[PDB]
Design a protein around this ligand. Structure first.
Ligand SMILES: [Zn+2]
Ligand SMILES: [Zn+2]
Ligand SMILES: [Zn+2]
Lengths: 65, 129, 50, 51, 114, 1023, 50
């Protein structure tokens, strides 16, 4: 549902990078360019950000109890 | 000591003639009609009601003409009376199915002739829509 | 193989192809084309193994 | 096993009033010589044919 | 091989033979009208049925977009290069493999086989 | 101007985007129901026979109009409160709307005084409403409103909620009606079959089929051999086979020449004439029309005692029972004969071999019945019984002389329960009726995954019975191209019987043929009644829904005008299809529903009608009041059905038709937008399916449905018996363009994995896989499991009733050893309590004539925490509650993991990060698969996908997975990878975790997308 | 494909390897061949087990 805390392969933190990843996308930066800025040299971590879906956005639409 | 596959059963049932599930429904309907209106008696037993639903659900024929035609068609052959109702009630799709379900047929029926009999039953059995 | 199949098709188109005594023209044409395609797969496949 | 169907090309039922008519022109040349011998011609012959 | 209808009731004229005049005449049964037959042929039957398909091919297939078009063979009586060709559609001739050409001109409708 | 090939790749996908934006993925479900609820329901009521009651007092009851209101819930108070679709699922009640009918009765008591009363909006009953339909509460609502109602905006709908269960009406293929088909069967006593099932418009009477057979030459006899082959036609109500020639005599064509005129159009051809001669011999003795009517009535089902009755019975059978579609009145003898002659004429062509036999599997000969057409047939069953109930109820009232109130006469239960029964159990028709039922339809909607839900809605079923048995529905036919997905098919005995609709393909909703019929009259078209039979020899035949409208002198001009009208959205709708059988001089126009068709770009003079300006408007499709419908209006794109696709040329891509060194075909009529659209919902998500083996693509279709993931967004509010939701459903690195339309990107059902294909420690066989224990500890494939428990306390018996309370050991006599501290004072466990093993989660007791415990324990021994508890009142009004138990399943050695293609592989062993083979950069693969699977039970696409995934991740761009995109190539991907300091083929040097020495073989490692299948070891063992 | 076409591509000859990628026409023809195998495999197990 939400971005994982760290890469499942090595263990590098990726949750904190999600907030900056989206901010860079709207800043006219390329999809791959944003990953380099965050400091994801390994392709395993770049996977966690390049092709991630934030489903919690649609779940938050529904009102709570 | 009795087995249907080997055509062994009490000698009393030999004189009896088998009946189809759809045909029995007609007999039950005749019994139901008279009891309901002809005479003022107690309601029919639960056993009678249970078998009526079973016959109606598994009734493979609409009217008596279809039932009579199948009965006449199978009577021309050497089919045993036990197989007469069992084959019609089961309605095997193909000859191979009937022999496995009915071991007796394999004794005196070939793979080709029987297939020409089951398909005839298919042309008689009526579907809902 | 593709060119050979066309040549076989052309022969049948012009009635030049002669059916084998043990088969008819329509079936004979299907046999000749099948061998050309079947042989190509085996020949190309064998080269791949090497 | 071969039948007449596999060896026959075409068939027709023609009408010839008299035995010598042979309305079919092409076969008139060869039927004449064969028919000279009165084989089965001892009496009337039906004017039908099954060539 | 053909079929003829009488003028009285327009019914089948079965072949009948008379013993007096010894002439085959097509006579109706229900109506007394009878007419003589000049063909002297009752019917024919081609066992191999090697009937030419040119008469069967319809001239209106020129406008068909699916049928392939080849300019190698022109029409005999037109000279137009374009000509639509296809194989026999008859199941009887399915065993044989042949090509039938039809002129692509709007009104020619000529059919020929090479 | 024109679309350049360098830009066609982006342009082609833009038009497809508009098609799904306007139509959608469930348009075929909604459209058919909309037609059924808008016109078919009205037609059934309007076409109802008059109700007549007699015993002097005459009562005539007629239904004037039908009024339908939006769904509402009727409680004990009876107020018409709105009933939201979500409420239906939670309360386990059918989602439906009330049905109202206007009834007008005229009563005459022999007093020469007629008076009538008006009944406004009589409560006839109710009709289940398909979700997202015109009458649904969620039609035309913005995404914001749907969330407020606890409904997923991405959910396409198109199903019925019955008793809280979502049911989808599986389309059932049926043989097309009002069509002549000639088939050859070697088992029948006759050589050829003139089968032609004829029915009127939507349905006025039950379908009637007549087989105009032709006796085989095998039989030999004194007279049979002479005449040889004769035609025999069997009437629907005549047991014996009567000669076809006698039928025409019964119509009124006493003259024998007229019989040949209708059958033989070309008198010059003698081959066909000889075939009809023997048929005349049998019917020759019957010369008078009355004798022919007498002859037919002799073998009738119920022959009349008197001679005159036989003629009347035959007259009614031929007029009404026979060929209902061509004519139902008493002045259609000429029209009926012409159609009958055509059937014989069609038989003659097939017998002589000049016409090819109709293909059994041809989808043009098969019609698809959706929820609309299916429910339309069902609605007649209850409505017909509804009149009987009114008649029977009034019968006892009428004979007594007193008027009968209508409120009691109309039965609501039959209409309500009648539709609800079959839609729930799945057995069509009436179980009271003594006939065999139809099982397998209205199945439980598969909500395991969003892709599975989409596939189920578009699911198709092959015909059953004689039609399916004779044909080969399992075998894949050529007609499925672009209409039914070839790869997608369930694996097992029922392989190929169940299929899925193609993405772009949709089934015709249906339309009235009246506008088309009127169009022909004003043009050169001439009806049969006006012309003589001799004019049919040269002209072309025109058919409208299988009806003999009449021949046309010039076929080319009319079709060109007809084509223009279709492209211009004139009186002829784009849905309508016109078929031009050039080889047979037959023009067939079909307007009935159930016709599967797909859009196709129109090509004129080897030039696409779709220009750059059209794409430019589509690029700005939003805020410009431009949609897909505009494209059809401009005539750039139209719809082609299976029959019209028969005589329509297609081009794969514009590059094929623009120019070629050797012209394969210089006359292209239509061009496919993109070939990949042939794939279905489950097949579309597969990259490089062409690179993949056909069985593997079919295998994935089954695995894809079984994959666990986020099925919808509003999962928390709803309660489902089985629902698996993934912790981190991540969109794939390699995605197909069609994936966007499926919305699988928004709701994926898998997690990518850096898969190194190697044989590590020999713990993975052909069917196995090795995981990374450290990765799972970080949430590699973990998912939640939801099981909903339902229970209601109902007063079934006056003496004994169910109640909800704590089953105390003292007050309760019979009980099972378990912990009862979990239950609260109300007998329901509150949310947030951990439950493990055998534990009571809901308290229920029966006051038997002291109470006996009948509570419900956990189905399995799994340890879970209750998520939410719901208390409601069922339809009967009794207290009813639902509770969802939530458990967390950690992937282990017994779980089955499957790639996007290939056979599922169980996790042979889990290894820690240290034990896994690390590369030079320190990247331990998340999953290791057996290399020996790749050869046979796997595809090279896995290696290509790994290569694409490595490039996609390294370059930070989502790869394109178009099956037939020439831009993407293995060599091109390899070159891109080499630019990022990686092997062009993706091979890497992996250092063994146990021993640090380099492995001699360089392993191939890449981020391959993977999905977790529902099959888990915990479920099996816990059972 | 044009009417009455007996060429390699028209009749289902697949000249492209899995690695190279099959043409749209070949993909459907490949599916038809694979479908027959699945049907045969499904019935083969049922008959052989009997
Ligand atoms: Zn990482
Ligand atoms: Zn006459
Ligand atoms: Zn010409």
């Amino acid at each position: 549902m939400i971005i994982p805390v760290r890469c499942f392969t090595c263990g590098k933190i990726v949750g904190n990078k999600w907030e900056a990843y989206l901010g860079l996308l709207q800043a006219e930066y390329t999809e791959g360019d944003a990953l380099d800025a965050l400091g994801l040299k390994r392709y395993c971590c770049r996977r966690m950000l390049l092709a991630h879906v934030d489903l919690i956005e649609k779940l938050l639409n529904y009102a709570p109890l | 000591e009795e087995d249907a596959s080997q055509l062994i059963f009490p000698k009393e049932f030999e004189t009896a003639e088998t009946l189809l599930n759809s045909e029995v429904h007609m007999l039950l309907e005749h019994r139901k009609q008279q009891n309901e209106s002809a005479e003022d008696e107690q309601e029919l037993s639960e056993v009678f009601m249970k078998t009526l639903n079973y016959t109606a659900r598994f009734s493979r024929f609409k009217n008596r003409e279809t039932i009579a035609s199948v009965r006449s068609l199978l009577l021309q052959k050497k089919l045993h009376k036990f197989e007469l109702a069992c084959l019609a009630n089961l309605c095997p799709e193909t000859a191979e199915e009937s022999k496995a379900l009915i071991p007796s047929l394999e004794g005196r029926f070939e793979d080709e002739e029987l297939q020409q009999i089951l398909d005839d039953i298919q042309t008689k059995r009526s579907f809902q829509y | 193989a593709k060119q050979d199949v066309i040549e076989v098709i052309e022969k049948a188109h012009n009635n030049e192809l002669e059916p084998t005594p043990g088969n008819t023209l329509r079936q004979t044409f299907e046999n000749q084309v099948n061998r050309i395609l079947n042989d190509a797969r085996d020949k190309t496949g064998s080269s791949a193994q090497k | 096993h071969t039948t007449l169907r596999k060896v026959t090309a075409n068939t027709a039922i023609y009408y010839d009033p008299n035995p010598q008519s042979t309305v079919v022109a092409e076969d008139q040349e060869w039927v004449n010589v064969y028919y000279e011998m009165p084989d089965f011609d001892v009496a009337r012959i039906s004017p039908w044919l099954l060539r | 091989v053909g079929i003829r209808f009488c003028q009285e009731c327009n019914n089948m004229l079965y072949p009948k033979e008379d013993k007096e005049n010894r002439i085959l005449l097509y006579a109706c049964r229900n109506c007394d009208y009878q007419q003589e037959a000049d063909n002297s042929c009752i019917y024919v039957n081609k066992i191999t049925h090697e009937v030419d398909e040119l008469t069967q091919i319809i001239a209106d297939v020129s406008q068909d977009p699916t049928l392939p078009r080849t300019e190698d063979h022109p029409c005999q009586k037109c000279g137009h290069k374009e000509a639509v060709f296809f194989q026999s559609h008859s199941a009887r001739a399915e065993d044989a493999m042949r090509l039938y050409y039809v002129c692509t001109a709007p009104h020619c409708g000529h059919r020929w086989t090479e | 101007d024109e679309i350049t090939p360098d830009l066609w790749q982006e342009a082609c996908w833009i038009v497809i985007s508009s098609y799904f934006d306007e139509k959608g993925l469930v348009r075929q479900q909604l459209d058919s129901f909309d037609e059924f609820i808008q016109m078919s329901v009205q037609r059934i009521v309007e076409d109802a026979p008059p109700i007549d009651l007699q015993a002097p007092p005459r009562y005539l009851l007629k239904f004037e109009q039908i009024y339908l209101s939006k769904p509402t819930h009727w409680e004990r108070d009876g107020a018409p409160s709105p009933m939201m679709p979500n409420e239906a699922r939670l309360r386990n009640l059918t989602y439906s709307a009330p049905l109202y009918v206007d009834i007008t009765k005229t009563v005459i008591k022999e007093g020469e005084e007629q008076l009538q009363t008006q009944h406004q909006k009589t409560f006839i009953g109710k009709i289940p409403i398909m979700l997202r339909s015109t009458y649904c509460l969620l039609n035309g609502l913005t995404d914001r409103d749907l969330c407020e109602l606890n409904e997923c905006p991405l959910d396409p709908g198109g199903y019925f909620i019955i008793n809280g269960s979502e049911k989808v009406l599986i389309a059932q293929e049926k043989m097309a009606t009002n069509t002549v088909y000639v088939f050859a069967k070697k088992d029948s006593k006759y050589a050829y079959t003139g089968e032609c099932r004829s029915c009127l418009e939507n349905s006025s009477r039950p379908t009637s089929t007549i087989w105009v057979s032709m006796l085989a030459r095998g039989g030999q006899g004194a007279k049979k051999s002479a005449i040889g082959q004769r035609i025999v036609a069997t009437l629907p109500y005549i047991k014996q086979e009567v000669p076809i020639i006698i039928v025409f005599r019964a119509l009124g064509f006493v003259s024998d020449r007229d019989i040949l005129e209708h059958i033989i159009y070309d008198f010059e051809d003698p081959e066909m004439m000889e075939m009809v001669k023997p048929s005349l011999d049998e019917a020759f003795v019957i010369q008078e029309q009355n004798v022919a009517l007498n002859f037919i009535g002799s073998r009738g089902a119920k022959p009349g005692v008197t001679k005159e009755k036989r003629i009347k019975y035959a007259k009614e059978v031929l007029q009404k029972e026979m060929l209902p579609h061509v004519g139902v009145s008493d002045f259609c003898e000429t029209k009926k004969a012409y159609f009958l002659g055509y059937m014989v004429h069609r038989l003659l062509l097939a017998a002589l071999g000049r016409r090819e036999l109709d293909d059994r599997d041809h989808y043009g000969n098969k019609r698809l019945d959706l929820a609309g057409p299916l429910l339309a047939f069902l609605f007649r069953g209850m409505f017909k019984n509804l009149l009987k109930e009114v008649r029977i109820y009034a019968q006892k009232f009428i004979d007594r002389g007193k008027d009968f109130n209508l409120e009691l006469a109309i039965k609501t239960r039959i209409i309500s329960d009648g539709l609800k029964y079959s839609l729930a159990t799945g057995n069509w028709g009436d179980q009271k009726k003594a006939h065999q039922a139809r099982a397998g339809v209205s199945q439980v909607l598969n909500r395991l995954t969003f892709a599975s839900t989409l596939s189920h809605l578009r699911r198709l079923n092959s015909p059953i019975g004689r039609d399916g048995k004779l044909a080969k529905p399992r075998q894949l036919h050529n007609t499925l191209w672009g209409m039914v997905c070839p790869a997608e098919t369930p694996e097992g005995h029922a392989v190929g019987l169940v299929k899925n609709l193609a993405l772009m393909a949709y089934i015709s909703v249906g339309s009235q043929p009246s506008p088309i019929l009127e169009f022909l009259e004003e043009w050169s078209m001439e009806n049969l009644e006006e012309i003589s039979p001799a004019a049919i020899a040269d002209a072309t035949k025109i058919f409208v829904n299988g009806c003999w409208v009449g021949i046309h002198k010039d076929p080319e001009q009319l079709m060109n005008t007809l084509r223009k009208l279709r492209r211009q959205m004139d009186i002829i709708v784009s849905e309508v299809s016109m078929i031009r059988d050039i080889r047979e001089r037959e023009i067939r126009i079909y307007t009935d529903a159930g016709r599967i068709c797909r859009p196709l770009l129109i090509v004129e003079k080897q030039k696409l009608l779709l220009k750059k300006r059209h794409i430019d408007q589509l690029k700005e499709r939003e805020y410009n009041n431009y949609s897909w419908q505009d494209l059809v209006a401009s005539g750039v794109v139209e719809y082609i059905d299976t029959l019209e696709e028969e005589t329509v040329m297609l081009a794969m891509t514009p590059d094929d038709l623009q120019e070629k060194e050797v012209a394969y075909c210089s006359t292209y009529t239509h061009c496919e937008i993109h070939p990949s659209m042939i794939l279905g919902v489950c097949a579309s998500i597969i990259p490089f399916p062409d690179h993949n083996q056909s069985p593997r693509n079919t295998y994935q279709s089954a695995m894809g449905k079984q994959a666990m993931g986020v099925y919808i967004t509003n999962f928390h509010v709803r309660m489902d018996t089985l629902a698996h939701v993934l912790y981190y459903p991540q969109k794939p690195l390699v995605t197909t363009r069609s994936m966007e339309y499926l919305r699988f990107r928004e709701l994926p059902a898998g997690i990518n994995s850096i898969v190194a294909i190697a044989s590590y420690t020999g713990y993975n066989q052909e069917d196995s896989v090795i995981m990374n224990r450290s990765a799972v500890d970080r949430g590699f494939f973990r998912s939640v499991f939801y099981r909903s428990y339902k229970e209601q306390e109902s007063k079934k018996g006056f003496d004994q009733e169910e109640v909800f309370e704590k089953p105390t050991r003292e007050t309760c006599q019979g009980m099972r050893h378990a912990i009862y501290d979990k239950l609260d004072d109300d007998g329901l466990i509150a949310p947030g309590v951990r439950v493990s093993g055998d534990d009571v989660i809901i308290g229920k007791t029966v006051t038997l004539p002291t109470k006996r415990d009948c509570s419900t324990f956990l189905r399995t021994s799994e340890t879970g925490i209750v998520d939410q508890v719901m208390v409601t009142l069922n339809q009967e009004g009794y207290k009813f509650c639902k509770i969802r138990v939530r458990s967390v399943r950690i992937p282990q050695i017994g779980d089955k993991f499957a790639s996007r293609h290939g056979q599922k592989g169980t996790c042979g062993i889990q290894y820690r990060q240290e034990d896994m083979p690390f590369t030079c950069e320190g990247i331990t693969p998340d999953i290791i698969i057996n290399p020996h699977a790749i050869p046979s039970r796997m595809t090279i696409g896995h290696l290509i996908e790994c290569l694409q995934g490595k490039v996609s991740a390294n370059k930070g761009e989502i790869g394109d997975a178009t099956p037939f995109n020439d831009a993407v190539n293995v060599q091109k991907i390899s070159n891109l990878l080499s630019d990022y300091g990686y092997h062009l083929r993706g091979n890497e040097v992996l250092y063994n975790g146990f021993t640090g020495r380099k492995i001699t073989s360089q392993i191939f490692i890449g981020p391959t997308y993977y999905q977790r299948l529902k099959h888990m070891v915990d479920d099996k063992i816990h059972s | 494909f044009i009417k009455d076409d007996y060429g390699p591509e028209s009749r289902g000859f697949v000249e492209n390897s899995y690695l190279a990628g099959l043409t749209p026409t070949e993909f459907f023809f490949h599916a038809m061949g694979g479908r027959e195998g699945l049907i045969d495999t499904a019935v083969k197990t049922a008959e052989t087990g009997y």
